[PDB]
Automatic annotation (TrEMBL), chain A:
The lineage of its organism: Eukaryota, Metazoa, Chordata, Craniata, Vertebrata. It is found in: Chromosome; Cytoplasm; Nucleus. This is DNA-directed RNA polymerase subunit. Signal peptide: none annotated. RNA-dependent RNA polymerase that catalyzes the extension of a non-coding RNA (ncRNA) at the 3'-end using the four ribonucleoside triphosphates as substrates. An internal ncRNA sequence near the 3'-end serves as a template in a single-round Pol II-mediated RNA polymerization reaction. May decrease the stability of ncRNAs that repress Pol II-mediated gene transcription. The chain holds residues 290 to 337 of 1968 of the full protein. The gene is POLR2A. It comes from the Eukaryota. It comes from Sus scrofa (Pig). Belongs to the RNA polymerase beta' chain family. Coiled coil: none annotated.
Automatic annotation (TrEMBL), chain B:
It holds the Pfam family RNA_pol_Rpb5_N. It is found in: Nucleus. PANTHER family: DNA-DIRECTED RNA POLYMERASES I, II, AND III SUBUNIT RPABC1 (PTHR10535:SF0). GO terms for cellular component: RNA polymerase I complex; RNA polymerase II, core complex; RNA polymerase III complex. Keywords: DNA-directed RNA polymerase, Nucleus, Transcription. This is DNA-directed RNA polymerases I, II, and III subunit RPABC1. It comes from the Eukaryota. Belongs to the archaeal Rpo5/eukaryotic RPB5 RNA polymerase subunit family. Residues 3-93 form the RNA polymerase Rpb5 N-terminal domain.
From TrEMBL, chain D:
This is DNA-directed RNA polymerase subunit beta. The gene is POLR2B. RNA-dependent RNA polymerase that catalyzes the extension of a non-coding RNA (ncRNA) at the 3'-end using the four ribonucleoside triphosphates as substrates. An internal ncRNA sequence near the 3'-end serves as a template in a single-round Pol II-mediated RNA polymerization reaction. May decrease the stability of ncRNAs that repress Pol II-mediated gene transcription. It comes from Sus scrofa. Belongs to the RNA polymerase beta chain family. It is found in: Nucleus.
Length: 48, 209, 98, 85
DNA sequence: ACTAGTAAAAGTACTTGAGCTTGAT
RNA sequence: CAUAAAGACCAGGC
DNA sequence: ATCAAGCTCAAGTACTTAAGCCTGGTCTATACTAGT
């Protein structure tokens, strides 16, 4: 995200970037929230 | 019809006579043992298009230890009461210079009138009851123990000879029917005297807030 | 029968699906078409052997939405333990309800 | 019943089609790593940590659609799909 | 071709919905 | 002495 | 005669919850795509 705000991106790519950054800092604290399809690493096993 | 309604008016009136008898006012003994026929011959036979109107049932009583303190008992005519009737009764209380009042509501209230009863707090404190609630004295029931309201010196020896603070007592909220039977505001301690099967008698205390 | 048949339709469908996905890339060039190299053989074999080997009656990448407890290990203490284990029914109602 | 009742792969100018016709079952046979067949015993399957499974073969026919007044179908026999325990 | 990236009740808490009372008129 | 991971499911004992 | 302001009661839609301790077993790390 940092290089794509220092290179002047299309500003609608950034929405799909801050959206996924929101998901990746918001799953690590609370994974089992209702809605928001879960994160998983291997064998379909969701994270702790 | 009308015999059930005058039965209700007798039983409500008797309940209010024990109520202000228990709050600490001056009540003659003749209207406490008032049989239905003395009511029926004094105030009238039927309230259906009749002589007990729900007007001329009002009761004005006076305190024992001070002759200034009086309390008025209003029996409103219309079923649900607005603000205008509360301004009528508050006007009569304004010109007659009386502070305490009861409003035995027939069917129910309106919430802006209730906000018009809680807003005059430091002067003109009015209380709201219901006809369905006043047909039995809850203090004489099997489960309800003896409540005795405590003066300020006695609260000082409670909080001084147990070495408590004031918040460290058990509590009671001022919306149960017994603390509305005694008319208790926030900050006052009721004493409850109940008989037990381990010691014989137990005295506990409650802070009203 | 009616468990390995249900297990077999879902891997005949999948093998025909990668027959299509191998078929479309080899037809845009218009060269020819082949099937002895189109058929990936690990689908049916590793799928039946997988869901018999571990119990979870489904796929490997959906290993938590599956009804486990089918295809378990045969019991060999006494001969009537074995004859009871080969003759056993089971109902899929959950085992914490009351 | 499963290999018969399957949707075909109609897809396109020339186009290639294939259909599955009849299925054939062998008894279990061990294919050793050097590429040798032998019928394997269940005790051999227990002791060596093997699988007691049998390979599966099927027929495939193939049709071309180009409308060059020539319909050349090519028939196949015994095409290896997989192994059934 | 070989091998490394890779997408059952049951309690409460919050929201909307309909209708009331009341000051304005 | 030191090193034998960890998760998922299953069948059991009181 | 209707018209907003403010408020109460009722129904609709999610979140959170289910005994303790102990002993053995088998299986699994992703099948698929681009670097190299």
């Amino acid at each position: 995200l940092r290089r794509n705000e220092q290179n002047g991106a299309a500003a609608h790519v950034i929405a799909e970037d801050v959206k996924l950054l929101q998901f990746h800092v918001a799953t690590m604290v609370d994974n089992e929230l209702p809605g928001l399809p879960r994160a998983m690493q291997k064998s379909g096993r969701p994270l702790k | 019809d009308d015999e059930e309604e005058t039965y209700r008016l007798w039983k409500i009136r008797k309940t209010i006579m024990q109520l202000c008898h228990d709050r600490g006012y001056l009540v003659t003994q003749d209207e406490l043992d008032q049989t239905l026929e003395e009511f029926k011959a004094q105030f009238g036979d039927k309230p259906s298009e009749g002589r007990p109107r729900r007007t001329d049932l009002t009761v004005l009583v006076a305190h024992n230890d001070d002759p200034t303190d009086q309390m008025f008992v209003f029996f409103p005519e219309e079923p649900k009461v607005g603000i205008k009737t509360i301004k009528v009764y508050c006007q009569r209380m304004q010109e007659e210079n009386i502070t305490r009042a009861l409003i035995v509501v027939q069917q129910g209230m309106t919430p802006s009138a209730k906000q018009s009863l809680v807003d005059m707090a430091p002067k003109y404190i009015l209380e709201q009851f219901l006809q369905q609630e006043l047909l039995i004295n809850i203090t004489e029931h099997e489960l309800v123990p003896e409540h005795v309201v405590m003066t300020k010196e006695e609260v000082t020896e409670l909080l001084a000879r147990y070495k408590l603070r004031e918040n460290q007592l058990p509590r009671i909220q001022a919306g149960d029917p017994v603390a509305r039977y005694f008319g208790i505001k926030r900050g006052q301690v009721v004493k409850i005297i109940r008989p037990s099967e381990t010691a014989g008698r137990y005295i506990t205390y409650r802070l009203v807030q | 029968g009616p468990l390995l048949a249900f297990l077999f339709r879902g891997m005949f469908k999948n093998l025909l699906k990668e027959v299509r996905i191998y078929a479309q890339k080899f037809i845009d060039r218009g060269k020819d078409f082949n099937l002895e190299l189109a058929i990936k053989t690990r689908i049916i074999s590793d799928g039946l052997k997988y869901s018999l080997a571990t119990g979870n009656w489904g796929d490997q990448k959906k290993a938590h939405q599956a009804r486990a407890g089918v295809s378990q290990v045969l019991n060999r203490l006494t001969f009537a333990s074995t004859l009871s284990h080969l003759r056993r029914l089971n109902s899929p109602i959950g085992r914490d309800g009351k | 019943r499963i290999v018969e009742d399957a949707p075909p792969i109609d897809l396109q100018p020339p186009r290639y089609l294939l259909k599955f016709e009849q299925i054939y079952l062998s008894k279990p046979t061990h294919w050793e790593r050097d590429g040798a067949p032998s019928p394997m015993m269940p005790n051999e399957a227990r002791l060596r940590n093997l699988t007691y499974s049998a390979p599966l073969y099927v027929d495939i026919t193939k049709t071309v659609i180009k409308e060059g007044e020539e319909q050349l179908q090519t028939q196949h026999q015994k095409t290896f799909i997989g192994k059934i325990p």
